Amino acid sequence: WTPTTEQIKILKELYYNNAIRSPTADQIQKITARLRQFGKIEGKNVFYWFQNHKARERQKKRFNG
């Protein structure tokens, strides 16, 4: 799975406007339903997108990050 550009923009809006980091399972279902209007996507793709960003935040907080 690779998000479409529009899906990425929506995911970043949720991440930076709502400050979502670890959505509930109900949130993942609702987010997936909206993202599906812009292309293929499954709920686990949303779960892992937020998980991958947690790892990226940890990298940005290291000395050489």
Residue numbers in the entry: 39 to 103
Text from the published report:
The HD transcription factor WUS plays key roles for plant development with at least four distinct and essential subfunctions: Firstly, regulation of stem cell identity in the shoot apical meristem (SAM), where it is required for non cell-autonomous induction and maintenance of stem cell fate via stimulation of cytokinin and suppression of auxin signaling. Consistent with a broad functional portfolio, WUS has been shown to bind to a diverse set of DNA motifs in the regulatory regions of downstream genes involved in SAM development and signaling processes. Here, we have combined molecular, biochemical, and structural approaches to address how the WUS-HD recognizes specific DNA target sites. We find that the DNA-binding preferences of WUS-HD depend on appropriately arranged sequence motifs in a direct tandem repeat and that homodimerization is one of the key determinants to achieve high sequence specificity.
